[PDB]
């Protein structure tokens, strides 16, 4: 429920897991661009599809979305313990892309693999940093079960919905999370 900028979307790829601000940055921008293209690709790369259901879906998603603030506090030490509940989001999104990745086309699979890898990378670095700095705990992903559970379907064009939803949310949550941690 709030328009957000897009900023650059290209910056080549990294060279190795340095676990530095540069490594994470490049991995975020790369994975972000790939996800976006892969998302719209489902609609034959139709710019219309990208902004087709982007009028109500933005405010009708079952998954969580960031929308608190762009900072903790300059002074006063009010409402301590800021920035959290990120492992769950990244966990679900990762399980979604990786889940559908197994059942995809040649191209979709090729790109899907890279998407998952990047996600796990940023998740490992972020989780590690927050793990060393502070604590953290998480139960376990259950959405996977529901998805795999299916509900009357085989090879129809209805899955494009659920997939498009999880994809849109994932990407959005990614860019947002980055901007939040970047404070710029």
Curated annotation (Swiss-Prot):
Disulfide pairings: 43-49, 72-82
Give the similarity note: Belongs to the IL-6 superfamily.
Question: What keywords are annotated for this sequence in UniProt?
Answer: Acute phase, Cytokine, Disulfide bond, Growth factor, Secreted, Signal
Q: What happens when the gene is disrupted?
A: Animals have normal T-cell numbers in the lamina propria but the T(H)17 cells are reduced by about 10-fold. They develop mature-onset obesity and have disturbed carbohydrate and lipid metabolism, increased leptin levels and decreased responsiveness to leptin treatment. Animals have impaired liver regeneration characterized by liver necrosis and failure. Mutants infected with influenza virus do not show a significant difference on germinal center B cells compared to wild-types.
Give a single Pfam family match: IL6
Q: How does it assemble?
A: Component of a hexamer of two molecules each of IL6, IL6R and IL6ST; first binds to IL6R to associate with the signaling subunit IL6ST. Interacts with IL6R (via the N-terminal ectodomain); this interaction may be affected by IL6R-binding with SORL1, hence decreasing IL6 cis signaling. Interacts with SORL1 (via the N-terminal ectodomain); this interaction leads to IL6 internalization and lysosomal degradation. May form a trimeric complex with the soluble SORL1 ectodomain and soluble IL6R receptor; this interaction might stabilize circulating IL6, hence promoting IL6 trans signaling.
Entry-linked InterPro entries: 4_helix_cytokine-like_core, IL-6-like, IL-6/GCSF/MGF, IL6/GCSF/MGF_CS
What Gene Ontology molecular-function terms does this entry list? cytokine activity; growth factor activity; interleukin-6 receptor binding
Q: Where are the transmembrane segments?
A: none
SMART domains referenced in this protein's UniProt entry, alphabetically: IL6
- Keyword Transmembrane present in the record's keywords: the answer is no
Modified after translation how?
N- and O-glycosylated.
| Signals that turn on the gene | In activated follicular B cells, expression is induced early after influenza virus infection. Plasma levels are highly increased upon exercise, due to enhanced production by contracting skeletal muscles.
Protein name per its UniProtKB record = Interleukin-6
Per the UniProt record, the source organism is: Mus musculus (Mouse)
């Amino acid at each position: 429920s709030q328009v957000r900028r897009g900023d650059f979307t290209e910056d080549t790829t990294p060279n190795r897991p340095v676990y530095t601000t540069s490594q994470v940055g490049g991995l975020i921008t790369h994975v972000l661009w790939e996800i976006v293209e892969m998302r719209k690709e489902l609609c034959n790369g139709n710019s219309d599809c990208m902004n087709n259901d982007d009028a109500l879906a933005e405010n009708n998603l079952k998954l969580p979305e960031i929308q608190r603030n762009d900072g903790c506090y300059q002074t006063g030490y009010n409402q301590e313990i800021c920035l959290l509940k990120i492992s769950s989001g990244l966990l679900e999104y990762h399980s979604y892309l990786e889940y559908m990745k197994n059942n995809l086309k040649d191209n979709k699979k090729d790109k899907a693999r890279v998407l998952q890898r990047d996600t796990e990378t940023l998740i490992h670095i972020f989780n590690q940093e927050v793990k060393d700095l502070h604590k953290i705990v998480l139960p376990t992903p259950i959405s996977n079960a529901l998805l795999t559970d299916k509900l009357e379907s085989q090879k129809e064009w209805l899955r494009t919905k659920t997939i498009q939803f999880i994809l849109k949310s994932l990407e959005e949550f990614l860019k947002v999370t980055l901007r939040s941690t970047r404070q710029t």
